[PDB]
Write a protein that holds these residues in place. Structure first.
Motif, PDB file in Angstrom:
ATOM      1  N   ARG A  51       0.793  -1.220   0.000  1.00  0.00           N
ATOM      2  CA  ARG A  51       0.000   0.000   0.000  1.00  0.00           C
ATOM      3  C   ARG A  51       0.827   1.274   0.000  1.00  0.00           C
ATOM      4  O   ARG A  51       0.309   2.319  -0.407  1.00  0.00           O
ATOM      5  CB  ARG A  51      -0.941   0.033   1.214  1.00  0.00           C
TER       6      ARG A  51
ATOM      7  N   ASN B   9       2.307   3.430   2.398  1.00  0.00           N
ATOM      8  CA  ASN B   9       1.902   4.545   3.242  1.00  0.00           C
ATOM      9  C   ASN B   9       3.121   5.417   3.542  1.00  0.00           C
ATOM     10  O   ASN B   9       4.224   5.176   3.043  1.00  0.00           O
ATOM     11  CB  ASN B   9       1.222   4.025   4.504  1.00  0.00           C
ATOM     12  N   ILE B  10       2.939   6.441   4.370  1.00  0.00           N
ATOM     13  CA  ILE B  10       3.980   7.429   4.626  1.00  0.00           C
ATOM     14  C   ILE B  10       4.130   7.628   6.125  1.00  0.00           C
ATOM     15  O   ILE B  10       3.233   7.285   6.905  1.00  0.00           O
ATOM     16  CB  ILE B  10       3.668   8.771   3.934  1.00  0.00           C
ATOM     17  N   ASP B  11       5.276   8.183   6.527  1.00  0.00           N
ATOM     18  CA  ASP B  11       5.542   8.465   7.931  1.00  0.00           C
ATOM     19  C   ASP B  11       6.179   9.833   8.139  1.00  0.00           C
ATOM     20  O   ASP B  11       6.599  10.138   9.263  1.00  0.00           O
ATOM     21  CB  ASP B  11       6.445   7.384   8.525  1.00  0.00           C
ATOM     22  N   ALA B  12       6.290  10.646   7.089  1.00  0.00           N
ATOM     23  CA  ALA B  12       6.810  12.008   7.049  1.00  0.00           C
ATOM     24  C   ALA B  12       8.328  12.060   7.196  1.00  0.00           C
ATOM     25  O   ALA B  12       8.908  13.126   6.986  1.00  0.00           O
ATOM     26  CB  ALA B  12       6.183  12.935   8.109  1.00  0.00           C
ATOM     27  N   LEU B  13       8.987  10.950   7.520  1.00  0.00           N
ATOM     28  CA  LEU B  13      10.447  10.840   7.570  1.00  0.00           C
ATOM     29  C   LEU B  13      11.092  12.058   8.229  1.00  0.00           C
ATOM     30  O   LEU B  13      11.956  12.726   7.661  1.00  0.00           O
ATOM     31  CB  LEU B  13      11.013  10.615   6.171  1.00  0.00           C
ATOM     32  N   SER B  14      10.658  12.333   9.456  1.00  0.00           N
ATOM     33  CA  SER B  14      11.148  13.490  10.200  1.00  0.00           C
ATOM     34  C   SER B  14      12.402  13.156  10.993  1.00  0.00           C
ATOM     35  O   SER B  14      12.703  13.799  12.000  1.00  0.00           O
ATOM     36  CB  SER B  14      10.055  14.028  11.118  1.00  0.00           C
TER      37      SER B  14
END
Lengths: 51, 52
Positions: free
Chosen positions: B34, B36-41
């Motif tokens: 899928r 998805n994303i985690d904003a890679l902060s």
């Protein structure tokens, strides 16, 4: 030296201006971090609706 | 007439069973990703790109 004095003063002023942009870049960083988190959340909900 | 109907239905049901057996068999190939994303902060790497 007098000219070296003016140069050092101007360079320290340039440092301070770079620090003002440091503040503005900090604001950009923080708001864009909010954007990143909001995007994580919205993408999660969009994928759920897809399911 | 009953015999003809029975034989036709038997053939149709046998074909449908042959299809449906494999239809139910390998239906898990639909499992995919899928992305998805985690904003890679938390990426704080250095500028050393030599591999391109």
């Amino acid at each position: 030296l007098k000219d070296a004095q003016e140069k050092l003063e101007l360079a320290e002023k340039k440092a301070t201006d770079a620090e003002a942009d440091v503040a503005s870049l900090n604001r950009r960083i923080q708001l864009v971090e909010e954007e990143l988190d909001r995007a994580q959340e919205r993408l999660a909900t969009a994928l759920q609706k897809l399911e | 007439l009953g015999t003809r109907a029975k034989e036709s239905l038997d053939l149709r049901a046998h074909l449908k069973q042959v299809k449906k057996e494999d239809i139910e068999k390998e239906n898990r190939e639909v499992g995919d990703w899928r992305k998805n994303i985690d904003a890679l902060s938390g990426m704080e790497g250095r500028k050393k790109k030599f591999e391109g």
